[PDB]
Design a protein around this ligand. Structure first.
Ligand SMILES: Nc1nc2c(ncn2[C@@H]2O[C@H](COP(=O)(O)OP(=O)(O)NP(=O)(O)O)[C@@H](O)[C@H]2O)c(=O)[nH]1
Ligand SMILES: [Ca+2]
Ligand SMILES: [Ca+2]
Ligand SMILES: [Mg+2]
Length: 163
């Protein structure tokens, strides 16, 4: 039917895998096993359309990408709200996306994850400002509670549809 190729990128430990696994498998991964490159598939109905999501869960750790990202149609750019450095490095991921796609207009959503945690160093307004400069939505999530998880991924699908 209708297939959407989604790619999740961002710094090591920000919760890329936990987000993807919550969406697809409906549980929270508490442990931290660094990812190399994993993929997930699932059929879902989004706004009345039956569709297939193909989700690529990428590595954040420099040790553990460009080739995999090439076929991506939309990207979640993830940072954690308790990790200022992960936010500051979002530009690096966007730059990589623009290179692999050879376009300055690629569907993306900015995601501030771990919103259940109280040691916040990135305020919502700061992230909204970054997103606005890129012309994309900002959404906060918790892979732990499931807050915003479906919204983040489904919003990305709706961004691809505007492309
Ligand atoms: N409290 C809380 N912990 C979270 C959340 N998301 C992820 N974590 C925790 O953060 C750690 C790293 O999560 P993980 O999903 O493995 O991160 P990653 O971005 O995929 N890492 P990598 O880039 O190395 O593959 C895990 O211990 C996980 O339980 C969240 O929303 N809230
Ligand atoms: Ca668990
Ligand atoms: Ca290129
Ligand atoms: Mg991972």
């Amino acid at each position: 039917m209708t297939e959407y190729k989604l790619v999740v990128v961002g710094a090591g430990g920000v919760g890329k895998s936990a987000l993807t696994i919550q969406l697809i498998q409906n549980h929270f991964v508490d442990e931290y096993d660094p990812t190399i490159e994993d993929s997930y598939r699932k059929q879902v109905v989004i706004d009345g359309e039956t569709c297939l999501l193909d989700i690529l869960d990428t590595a954040g750790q420099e040790e553990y990408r460009d080739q995999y990202m090439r076929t991506g149609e939309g990207f979640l750019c993830v940072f954690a709200i308790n990790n200022t450095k992960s936010f500051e490095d979002i530009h690096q991921y966007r730059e990589q996306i623009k290179r692999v796609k050879d376009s300055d207009d690629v569907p993306m959503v900015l995601v501030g994850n771990k919103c259940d945690l109280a040691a916040r160093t990135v305020e919502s307004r700061q992230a909204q400002d970054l997103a606005r400069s890129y012309g994309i939505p900002y959404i906060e999530t918790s892979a732990k509670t499931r807050q915003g998880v479906e919204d983040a991924f489904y919003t990305l699908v709706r961004e691809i549809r505007q492309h």
